[PDB]
From Swiss-Prot, chain B:
Class II viral fusion protein. Fusion activity is inactive as long as E1 is bound to E2 in mature virion. After virus attachment to cell receptor LDLRAD3 and endocytosis, acidification of the endosome induce dissociation of E1/E2 heterodimer and concomitant trimerization of the E1 subunits. This E1 trimer is fusion active, and promotes release of viral nucleocapsid in cytoplasm after endosome and viral membrane fusion. Efficient fusion requires the presence of cholesterol and sphingolipid in the target membrane. It is a single-pass type I membrane protein. N-glycosylated. The chain holds residues 966 to 1013 of 1254 of the full protein. Interacts with spike glycoprotein E2. The precursor of protein E3/E2 and E1 form a heterodimer shortly after synthesis. Processing of the precursor of protein E3/E2 into E2 and E3 results in a heterodimer of the spike glycoproteins E2 and E1. Spike at virion surface are constituted of three E2-E1 heterodimers. After target cell attachment and endocytosis, E1 change conformation to form homotrimers. Interacts with 6K protein. Interacts (via fusion peptide loop) with host LDLRAD3 (via domain LDL-receptor class A 1); this interaction mediates viral entry to the host cell. It comes from Venezuelan equine encephalitis virus (strain TC-83) (VEEV). It is found in: Virion membrane; Host cell membrane. This is Spike glycoprotein E1.
Amino acid sequence: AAGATLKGKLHVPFLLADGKCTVPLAPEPMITFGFRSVSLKLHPKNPT
Amino acid sequence: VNFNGVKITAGPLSTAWTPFDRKIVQYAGEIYNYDFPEYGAGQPGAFG
């Protein structure tokens, strides 16, 4: 319209709020040793 | 062999060659060559 359109204010629901979410945990890696060296065999399920 | 008079001692073969290694795997009608672990050394993640 022409004159002055701003009549009121709404409130937006479902805002981004905090909490806790259950994220996965990788399989236990295999750790071989060596002089000044650590060798790791890694076997994931999903990308990690 | 002994069919008629003659006997034929075919043998040996002049090489001990095999395409088959000591350790072999059979699956899906196909014979792979693979160094599978023995009965007890089955590491997690791989064959065994």
